[PDB]
Amino acid sequence: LTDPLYIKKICLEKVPEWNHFTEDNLRVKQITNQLFEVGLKEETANNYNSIRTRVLFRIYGKHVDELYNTISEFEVYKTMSKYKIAPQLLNTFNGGRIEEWLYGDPLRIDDLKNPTILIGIANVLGKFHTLSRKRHLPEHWDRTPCIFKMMEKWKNQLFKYKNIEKYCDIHKYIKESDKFIKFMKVYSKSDNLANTIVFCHNDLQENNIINTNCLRLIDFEYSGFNFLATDIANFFIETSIDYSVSSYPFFEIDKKKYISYENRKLFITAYLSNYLPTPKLIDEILEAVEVQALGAHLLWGFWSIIRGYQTKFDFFLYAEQRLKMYDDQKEYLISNNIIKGYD
Template identity: 35%
Template sequence: MAIKTIESLKGCGSEEEIMEIICAVGSDLGDVKDDVNSLEVIPMKGAMTNEVFEINWEAKNGGGVRKALLRLYGDGVEILFNREEEIKIFECISKHGQGPRLLARFTSGRVEEFLHARTLSAVDLRDPEISALIASKMREFHRLNMPGPKKVQLWQRMRNWLSESKTICFPKDIKNFGLENLDEEINMLEKLLSEGYEDIGFCHNDLQYGNIMMDEETRSITLIDYEYASYNPLAYDLANHFCEMVADYHSDTPHILDYTKYPELEERQRFIRIYLSSEGKKPSNARVEQLVNAAEKYTLANHLFWGLWGLISVS
């Protein structure tokens, strides 16, 4: 059921500012009714960091409905990522034709192009056809030429998060979670993983099913939500995607990860072979195995990364 604008946006910051932005976007569309009573704002489920709404304008002369997506930023996320950097990345990815267009921005959020595609489910990640499409899209995404230093961001981000975790956790939690020794473990892991194969590219870093959309007609894949995107080892991003296959965030127990669902070796090999083949050149078995092994090692970094994220998020 659609919920009228003011009711939907209660408690969402400056309602007046948000409404001005929404009306301005509607005006830019040109063919929508200039009547706030015909405007609908529908809360969308699934977002973890932000509040997300579908905006519907009634078109003039019975022309149907025009849509956009309103994203209201969550509180306290500045600890986890730089919002200004995320906006720059969003705009740059959009210019590359890899994501939704930015229609407007304001103090507490932004309005984006509404993608007429469906968000994938946990089950979709295991569908061989869909998985192959994701693998090809990942390769394309990793090859984006983005602004900023093209060096690994993973380790420094984890160190920053560890420092923040120590600040906000109670002493007993610092001890229980072993945070006193984690600096040393991060250093050790960085050294060990950096010694082997390490191809660097622009990584999404949060490739769970909710951040992947598919157009049912064209079967095209779009990766969305770039809060954690940065240059990193490609093996890390692949490892993250494999780890996300064990999660179902729409179950009754979204916090429980089922590692019986972790992809078997053959499935990981198939995904990486398609990933490497997507540019038209068949990879050698040795190259596939090299990246499969590197991704397996980077699962350790993924667990550590999202473990620290969890400590900060619940504090």
């Protein structure tokens, strides 16, 4: 399946506009899952201007079922595909799918410091979040907030690993997550707009946002119903994490890079213009986002341990950083009297 002759054979069989070509007409380039650009070679492309000349060929990661329900992932994707939110579905094959090729660049860490970019991301997220009240999403879909489901599932998965202390205070964090979850079942019941349940992406970060000749969202693996502030929290956290480091550990974290308050207000203002602003409301949303960040750290800390056991990026050292970020955020929130009856 990493065999380019086979990737070609599948594309010729599954992409109707390409069924007459042979593998001599096709180019394969490799670009947690496996992605290949598949495309018509230059001279072939030049004779076929009326059709797609590229596809994203996607081979499903071998252990993603430990993270999410595979059947649901696809159902959710087809819907985001039909609504033109996600990359268009071209076809499936045994072990993956073929998608529309997006022409554009993922955003980089430094784009998130640009207020104009921040806005367009806010504009896009705001309009995205109205989907559940403006279109009728399948009624059989689970409305339970994904924060709750992802946390329980990922915490429970950690039990499968026995030598887990060797990667240290994991049982403390596990306990800490039970505290977050208990606190959030109370917290989330107040009237705060930041508690509205909407259909969330659940993994916003610059590399899941593509800049085309407009900003598009991608990678809806984790997408599902969640507290709206959850979606904003991940994005805000991600302003301080750079994944482009090209040597061990392949990441950098800089607290000082965390999106300024000035830029956070700007973002929510732009967000609400598309989602729906009282200054009190902006600050109540910003508070909920800071409360949700607490749970984001535990969640992605657990996710990253699970990934480290799957693979063999230093997932374990990244897990360690996110769990440290939980400690810093907890101490920020408690010592500023923002959360109470947590411990």
